[PDB]
């Protein structure tokens, strides 16, 4: 076979399967193969991406035997893959070593559960890949407002919060203060009003914050950045960062924000957000007057 | 049981009524393997269904006359229980579509599509059989059929025909479209003679003693049933049980109800032409069509009544045969069968004035 | 063993016959990889369905078929999420890999094949809701529509499919098809017979091979070794013989209202078909010469309309009485 | 890859200079994309005119490589519900361009389909989100489009294909297929197309095929005649001149022959006699009237079947008829 | 590419602007001026200025508290029974300080469409809380509102733009670009446009992209004339032979669908004058089995010629 990755801490697919999901329920995920890792792209009305990786130190055995090709890209369904995962999942407190095989365009993607005694194989169907390409929604690394590090409870219970409160939008603020206060919150529209979560200027849930002036070089003090975001696709990292130990937030000009979430080797996780309109610019004014409130 | 289905033949070799039908089933029965698709047509009444089970028994053996009846369920695009009743037989089967109305295309293409898929393999016999290997399905009333449950069966009994053969009754076969006839072998079942069933009456008369005045009675009831057998017999019966089993010559000859009832509105026709005499049509329409009678079947009775009448001239009747057939067009054409029905009234009434 | 029908059905593309314009077409995509989208329209047993099945066939192998081709007819429900669903995830599919086997011996186009067949009863939602799913993956799954009437095609699926007419089978380009047919059959017909067969079967091949069948099952029940007559044939088809004509179109001469509706009502007893009375009427009094040019202008017309009015499926009786009624009045 | 492609699909426009007929609708669009302003455009036509061809090529224009994140295309064969229309489309128009091309475009194929309650709810996101994003309307039938809809968009209309770009692109399909095209095999293919570039290539891949060598052979007017089973010009003519003239015996002998000589349908037949007494000097005002309405029944029975020769006979006895007026 | 289109660019901002219904928008002035705004329902046909009439009203009854006093929710907008129950039950209880006589708006844009569970939990929202906001509907068919709605509301129906506001907006946008024009090419814009600012708007647009100078040549080569008043015209013709002609040169050759036609021609018949209605009954007749035809499959030039043939012979007899 072109490919063949094996191993054994399947809970280490299973969370990266479970972090796809929030990004639609039944659609098509890319899947992209090349020597450095295994990579499952998904993209949600060409306004957000995620992109997590499986590295080759996650697999025993990692061959990767294709050679005329740097890297082979596969579209299959989501639906069928956590349908068929879901009832082989029923004993998986058995030791299986899952078994990924792919032998080139027009052969199925195979996955195989052997707990020495049964061998379940489960050859997935592969469709035609559609005329997005996943490289468009890609922040500018030349060009970034602010850089965020923040820790991974922290986010995760901000946004419960906010989707508890509802949020149907969502604000970003990104200033530092000349002293040396550092100062990140997610300001949220919702029913019940103007609500603001800020995170701690301490270096324990707020490592580092950074803000430039559009050119990632320049460090700023007193402007700050203001990022308009549909909760809709802020709330598909919310699954992300519940096993993130750190999240790294990015902006540039454009309008396009790029969370990175590790976890702990592990699963890396990028998520590529863009920023709506802001048609009206009164928000922005109470958002400063918010704020400085 | 009735007299319809006590002396009712049971076999090939009971069949007297037609003899160069009752040769060509033998034809079609003597090598059963390779038997095609088979639509009868013909007058209601004439035998059709009793010739097909004669055919089966012929073929299958005995025993294709041991029915029951498996209730099944459907479900159509919207959830919603509907029953159809399934006549079943070790070695056929027997559906009505039309009795569960338009859905009748989700009763095709369920349950004559997985009869079709199973092979009925049953012991071994995976060569051929001249019997048990394929099935036999019988589809009454297939011109009530809407177009649609017509379309699915052209690919199943064209695909399927290693393991199903079907064997559909049905009179005036013009709502039938051409793929499926093209597919069938046409049988043409003509209606006995007044004699034949005169013949057969004078069976029945014998083995149950009604003590028969003279022939004549027999053949008048022939003549009134107008080639419908089971009429006659019904008939037979009634002025039997009616006459405490003494059949005499001035015998009154019984008629439905209906009949006698589309009789008087025809004459209520010819005599009042007026507005309140529709209304008092529609009104008679009405009742006639709560008792679930078929409204083509009300048309041509109406129609070929007031063609008897004897004091309308020629260019009253060509004109309301004209009539008939313009909304015997717009009946079939259509959704609600009063408009049509009470439209060729109005037009009989307004050309008879 | 089986029917004759499903016996003789074409295996492959030589075996299609009277339809070259078509077949020949076809053929030569087997060579080359090019093949467009397809509308087969004709009347009813006409091999539309045989030449589809014989180019599959010889364009997959036995193997590869089942994985390059989906087939939906009127047997299973085509409905607008059926055909935005499965037809756009089996268009959307990889090509599967050829075999060895398959490479070696079959040509193995790098494409699927979508067989739409009794096109002509989905719904015009349906059929547009596939335009973009033919136009988008047409390098990858080419699609296949059989009808019979072609004006149930909405014109934005037409124009996207290549138009094949299948041309009605007559006595001069079947003959030798039912020919073949009776010789392996080795059934003994009289001179003239089998041309017959072909006439009573207007533009069909299969009724053609079915009533051969049943002539072949009474002639060896009969057990005489004699050859099948015409007038056999004609019995068992349904056409209503020549002497009940005459006693019609005399009755009709008369003009007498009475007499024509008893004898209309005496001959529907006996189960004759509407549309074979009136087309042999049709017959009798197109072609002879003991008609004026008016009588025939009248009667095309009516014959035109009692046809019609038939062929909506309603009464059989009230129809021929009227249309007989009509003529004795021209 | 593209040579294993219909004609239909292997031919698709690619830039606007390869759009041909519509002249006045791509020099519109093209002075629009030059400007840079382009407003909410509403494409409508026949089928096979080149809207999609059009659309996709001006949004490649504009775009260049940046099509793929920068034009999202919706049609019939993907659900454009109520709830499509306020999640997607909306979430579409209203994030940013990630400053690639300045606006977004939204392209509408066949919107007909689309139901009221979409069309409806598509006008609050057309006219609010237009500073960043432009929508495209494709459609054949303008029935079916809400009037605010139409009025928020600006109509263009693509004609039929006239012969001239029929030509054109004839003379650029045969010199990349190496083909030979007789100037009468070329106007009997015109006449057919009936303003369709789909037709015109489906029928000349289909003479190609036909041609036992595809070089050094060239399609006369009785391949394509032969291969798309229409009548040819001298039939039809013998046929009419059978009925107006000839008695009821010889006219349907004479229709019957012609039938079988190539396995004529009588639709084809009934629509170039049409077409052939379309343009007689009738003088009775009342042969036209009862010519039209006979032959559109006898075209109407035809369509649900019947008894071919029995319509055969009508049409006859139909034109006789009619002609009965005039003299 | 920042170029926004002249329909957008040139939407008035104030209700000044607006031209057309001088009476409707002089007393939306008063309104504005006054403040006692009530509840109305605004209906017309699309593109006069229903909704830039109701948005400027908004913004000079308001002001600076125009962002937080203004709520407003169209077809675009999820408007269902709870958006009915929370979002707008919190807007109307929300307590703002608005100068004296101004009150919070509500607009409802194309509210034809909202549902009836919405439209009836509207009736309590405006019963309880009258008091502070006000709500303005607008649609374009105005029975589709339910009457228990209609009844606390004061209804404004607006008419057709003539062609004199028409040519004034047209000039007045003409000077604000500085496009070149002559007489007759407005008469032809504004002949096209049928009463649409909008789509006259669009038109002068286009017509000035494609070549410049707007006449009636360069108008005519873009923009079509009113398929409408070609099928009128084709079906009040005398003798058939010109009706035919008229079907088939600007109505089949130049593109229109048949069905199209069909539905375009059972509108002219149920408006058409000088007409018996006994002739209008059999023509709607004709054209409905016409359009039964279409719809079977059959849509073919012969259809609509005997469909013409028909009217004709009814016409003449
Ligand atoms: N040209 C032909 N050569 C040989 N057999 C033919 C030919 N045309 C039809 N047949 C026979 O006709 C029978 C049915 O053919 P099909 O193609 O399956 O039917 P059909 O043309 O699809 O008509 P439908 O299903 O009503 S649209 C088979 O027995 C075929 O062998
Ligand atoms: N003006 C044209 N010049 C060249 N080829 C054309 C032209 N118009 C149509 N075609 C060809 O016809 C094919 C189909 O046309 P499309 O533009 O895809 O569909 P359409 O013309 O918009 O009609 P509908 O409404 O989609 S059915 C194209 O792929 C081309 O090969
Ligand atoms: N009286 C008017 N004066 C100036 N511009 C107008 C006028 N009426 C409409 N417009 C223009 O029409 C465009 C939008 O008008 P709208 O008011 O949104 O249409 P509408 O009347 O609300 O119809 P609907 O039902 O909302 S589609 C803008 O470009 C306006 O400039
Ligand atoms: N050859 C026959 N001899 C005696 N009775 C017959 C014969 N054929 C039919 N019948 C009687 O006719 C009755 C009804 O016939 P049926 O099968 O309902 O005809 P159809 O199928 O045309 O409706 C049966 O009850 C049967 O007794
Ligand atoms: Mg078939
Ligand atoms: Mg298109
Ligand atoms: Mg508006």
Same mark, same amino acid.
Request: aromatic share 6%; glycine share 4%.
């Given at each position: ?293 | 049981?009735?007299? %319809? ?255 006698? %009832? ?12 007026? %507005? ?71 037009? %009989? ?5 | ?27 030569? /995509? ?18 539309? /369905? ?120 007559? &006595? ?29 079967? &207007? ?83 197109? /072609? ?17 309309? /009692? ?24 | ?327 | ?317």
């Amino acid at each position: 076979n072109k490919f063949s990755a094996s191993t054994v801490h399947l809970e280490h697919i299973t969370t990266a399967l479970s972090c796809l999901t929030p990004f639609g329920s039944k659609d098509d995920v890319l899947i992209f193969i090349d020597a450095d890792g295994l990579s499952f792209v998904r993209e949600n009305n060409h306004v957000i991406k995620i992109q997590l990786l499986l590295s080759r130190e996650l697999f025993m055995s990692y061959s990767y035997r294709n050679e005329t090709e740097d890297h082979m890209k596969l579209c299959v369904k989501i639906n069928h893959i956590l349908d068929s995962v879901s009832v082989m999942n029923r004993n998986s407190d058995d030791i299986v070593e899952c078994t990924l095989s792919y032998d080139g365009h027009g052969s199925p993607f195979v996955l195989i559960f052997e707990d020495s005694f049964i061998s379940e194989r489960v050859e997935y169907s592969t469709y035609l890949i559609k005329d997005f390409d996943t490289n468009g929604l890609e922040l500018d690394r030349e060009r970034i407002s602010f850089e965020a590090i923040i820790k991974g409870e922290a986010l995760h219970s901000a946004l419960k919060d906010l989707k508890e409160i509802g949020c149907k939008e969502c604000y970003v603020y990104a200033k530092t203060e000349a002293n040396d206060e550092n100062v990140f919150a997610l300001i949220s529209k919702s029913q019940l009003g103007f609500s603001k979560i800020k995170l701690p200027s301490n270096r324990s849930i707020l490592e580092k914050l950074q803000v430039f002036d559009g050119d990632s070089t320049t460090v700023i003090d007193g402007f700050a950045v203001i990022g308009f975001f549909d909760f809709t696709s802020f709330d598909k990292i919310r699954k992300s960062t519940k096993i993130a130990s750190k999240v790294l937030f990015r902006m540039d000009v454009h309008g396009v924000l790029s969370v990175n979430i590790l976890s702990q080797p592990g699963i890396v996780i990028e998520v590529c957000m863009l920023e709506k309109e802001s048609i009206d610019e009164a928000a922005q004014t109470e958002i400063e007057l918010l704020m400085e409130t | 049981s009735l007299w %319809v289905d006590k002396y009712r033949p049971k076999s090939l070799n009971a069949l007297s009524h037609n003899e160069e039908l009752t040769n060509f089933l033998k034809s079609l029965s003597d090598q059963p393997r390779d038997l095609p698709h088979l639509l009868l047509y013909g007058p209601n009444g004439t035998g059709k269904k009793t010739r097909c089970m004669a055919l089966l028994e012929s073929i299958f053996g005995p025993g294709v006359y041991r029915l029951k009846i498996d209730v099944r369920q459907f479900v159509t695009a919207s959830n919603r229980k509907l029953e159809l009743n399934v006549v079943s037989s070790p070695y056929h089967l027997e559906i009505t579509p039309s009795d569960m109305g338009n859905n009748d295309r989700i009763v095709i293409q369920e349950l004559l599509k997985e009869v079709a898929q199973m092979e009925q393999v049953d012991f071994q016999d995976s060569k051929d059989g001249l019997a048990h290997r394929y099935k036999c399905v019988i589809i009454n009333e297939a011109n009530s059929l809407t177009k649609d449950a017509q379309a699915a069966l052209r690919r199943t009994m064209e695909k399927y025909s290693k393991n199903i053969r079907l064997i559909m009754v049905c009179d005036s076969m013009s709502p039938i479209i051409a793929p499926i006839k093209s597919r069938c072998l046409l049988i043409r079942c003509p209606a006995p003679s007044d004699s034949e069933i005169s013949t057969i009456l004078s069976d029945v008369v014998t083995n149950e003693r009604i003590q028969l005045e003279t022939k004549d009675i027999l053949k008048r009831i022939a003549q009134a049933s107008n080639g419908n057998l089971r009429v006659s017999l019904l008939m037979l019966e009634s002025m039997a049980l009616n006459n405490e089993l003494a059949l005499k010559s001035s015998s009154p000859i019984i008629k439905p109800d209906w009949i006698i %009832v589309i009789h008087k509105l025809t004459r209520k026709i010819v005599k009042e032409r007026s %507005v309140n005499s529709l209304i008092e049509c529609r009104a008679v329409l009405y009742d006639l069509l709560a008792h679930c009678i078929p409204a083509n079947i009300i048309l041509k009775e109406l129609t070929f009544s007031l063609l008897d009448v004897e004091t309308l001239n020629t260019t009253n009747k060509s004109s309301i045969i004209e009539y008939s057939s313009v909304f015997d067009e717009r009946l079939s054409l259509g959704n609600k069968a009063i408009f049509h029905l009470e439209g060729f009234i109005a037009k %009989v009434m307004c050309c008879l004035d | 063993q089986q029917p004759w029908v499903e016996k003789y059905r074409p295996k492959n593309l030589d075996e299609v016959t009277a339809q070259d314009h078509a077949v020949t077409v076809l053929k030569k /995509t087997l060579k080359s990889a090019n093949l467009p989208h397809m509308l087969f329209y004709g009347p009813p047993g006409t091999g539309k /369905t045989s030449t589809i099945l014989a180019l599959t066939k010889e364009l997959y192998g036995p193997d590869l078929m089942k994985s390059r081709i989906l087939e939906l007819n009127a047997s299973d429900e085509r409905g607008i999420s059926i055909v935005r669903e499965k037809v756009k995830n089996f268009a959307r599919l990889t090509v599967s890999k050829p075999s060895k086997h398959d490479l070696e011996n079959y040509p193995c186009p790098p494409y699927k094949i979508i067989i739409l067949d009794e096109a002509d009863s989905m719904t015009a939602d349906a059929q547009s809701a596939l335009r973009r799913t033919m136009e988008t993956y047409s390098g990858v799954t080419r699609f296949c529509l059989i009808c019979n009437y072609v004006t149930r095609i909405i014109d934005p699926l037409a124009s996207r499919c290549s138009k094949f007419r299948f041309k009605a089978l007559d &006595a001069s380009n079947a003959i030798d098809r039912l020919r073949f047919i009776s010789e392996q059959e080795n059934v003994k017909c009289d001179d003239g017979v089998l041309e017959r067969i072909l006439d009573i079967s &207007a533009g069909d091949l299969r009724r053609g091979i079915t009533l051969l069948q049943s002539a072949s099952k009474g002639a060896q029940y009969l057990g005489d070794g004699k050859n099948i007559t015409s007038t056999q044939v004609e019995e068992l088809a349904g056409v209503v013989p020549h002497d009940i004509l005459i006693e019609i179109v005399e009755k009709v001469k008369s003009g007498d209202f009475d007499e024509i509706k008893k004898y209309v009502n005496t001959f529907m007893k006996s189960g004759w078909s509407a549309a074979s009375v009136v087309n042999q009427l049709h017959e009798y009094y197109i /072609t002879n010469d003991n008609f004026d040019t008016n009588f025939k202008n009248q009667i095309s017309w009516l014959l035109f309309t /009692t046809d019609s009015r038939l062929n909506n499926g309603t009464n059989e009786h009230i129809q021929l009485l009227n249309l007989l009624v009509k003529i004795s009045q021209l | 890859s593209k040579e294993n492609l219909p004609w239909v699909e292997k031919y698709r426009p690619e830039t606007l200079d390869e759009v041909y007929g519509q002249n006045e609708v791509i020099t519109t669009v093209r002075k629009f994309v030059d400007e840079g302003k382009l407003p909410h455009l509403l494409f409508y036509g026949p089928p096979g005119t080149g809207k999609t061809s059009t659309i996709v090529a001006l949004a490649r224009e504009i775009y260049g490589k940046n099509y793929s994140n920068m034009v999202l295309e919706l049609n019939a064969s993907d659900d454009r519900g109520i709830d499509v229309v306020r999640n997607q489309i909306k979430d579409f128009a209203s994030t940013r361009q990630i400053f690639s091309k300045g606006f977004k475009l939204i392209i509408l194929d066949e919107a007909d389909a689309m139901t009221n309650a979409a069309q409806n709810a598509l006008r609050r996101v057309i006219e609010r989100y237009t500073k960043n994003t432009r929508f495209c309307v494709l459609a054949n039938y303008a029935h079916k489009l809400t009037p605010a809809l139409l009025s928020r968009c600006t109509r263009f209309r693509f004609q039929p294909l006239p012969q001239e770009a029929i030509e054109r692109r004839i003379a650029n399909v045969l010199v990349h297929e190496k083909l030979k095209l007789s100037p009468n095999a070329e106007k009997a293919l015109i006449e057919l197309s009936n303003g369709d570039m789909r037709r015109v290539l489906n029928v000349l891949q289909s003479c190609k095929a036909t041609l036992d060598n595809p070089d050094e052979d060239e399609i006369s007017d009785d391949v394509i005649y032969e291969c798309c089973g229409a009548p040819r010009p001298s039939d039809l003519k013998a046929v009419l001149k059978s009925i107006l003239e000839d008695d009821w015996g010889t006219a349907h002998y004479t229709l019957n022959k012609v039938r079988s000589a190539k396995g004529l349908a009588l639709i084809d037949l009934i629509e170039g006699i049409v077409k052939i007494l379309e343009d007689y000097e009738l003088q009775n005002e009342e042969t036209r009237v009862h010519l039209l309405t006979k032959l559109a029944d006898i075209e109407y029975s035809i369509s649900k079947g019947g008894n071919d020769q029995i319509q055969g006979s009508a049409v006859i006895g139909a034109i006789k008829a009619s002609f009965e007026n005039e003299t | 590419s920042l170029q926004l289109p002249w329909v957008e660019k040139y939407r008035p901002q104030v209700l000044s602007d607006i031209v057309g219904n001088k009476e409707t928008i002089d007393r939306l002035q008063q309104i504005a001026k006054d403040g006692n705004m009530p509840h109305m329902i605004i209906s017309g046909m699309p593109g006069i200025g229903k909704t830039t009439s109701v948005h400027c009203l908004a913004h000079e009854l308001l002001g600076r508290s125009y962002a937080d006093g203004v709520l407003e929710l169209n077809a675009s907008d999820d408007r269902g029974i709870d958006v009915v129950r929370n979002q707008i039950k919190h807007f109307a209880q929300k307590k703002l300080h608005l100068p004296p006589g101004k009150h919070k708006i509500v607009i409802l844009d194309e509210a034809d469409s909202m549902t009836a569970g919405a439209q009836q939990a509207l009736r309590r929202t405006m019963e309880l809380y009258s008091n502070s906001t006000r709500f303005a509907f607008a649609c374009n068919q105005s029975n589709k509102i339910i009457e228990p709605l209609q009844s606390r509301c004061a209804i404004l129906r607006y008419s057709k733009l003539s062609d004199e506001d028409v040519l004034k907006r047209l000039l007045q946008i003409i000077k604000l670009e500085d496009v070149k024009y002559t007489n007759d090419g407005l008469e032809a814009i504004i002949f096209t446009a049928e009463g649409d600012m909008r789509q006259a708007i669009n038109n002068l647009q286009s017509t000035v992209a494609g070549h410049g100078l707007v006449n009636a040549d360069n108008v005519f080569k873009i923009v079509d004339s009113p398929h409408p008043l070609i099928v009128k015209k084709m079906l009040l013709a005398s003798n058939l032979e010109d009706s035919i002609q008229i079907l088939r040169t600007d109505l089949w050759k130049k593109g229109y669908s048949s069905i199209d036609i069909v539905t375009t021609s059972f509108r002219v018949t149920k408006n058409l004058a000088q007409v018996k209605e006994s002739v209008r009954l059999e023509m709607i007749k004709e054209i409905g089995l016409t359009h039964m035809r279409i719809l079977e499959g059959v849509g073919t030039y012969l259809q609509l010629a005997s469909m013409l043939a028909k009217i004709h012979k009814l016409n003449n007899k």
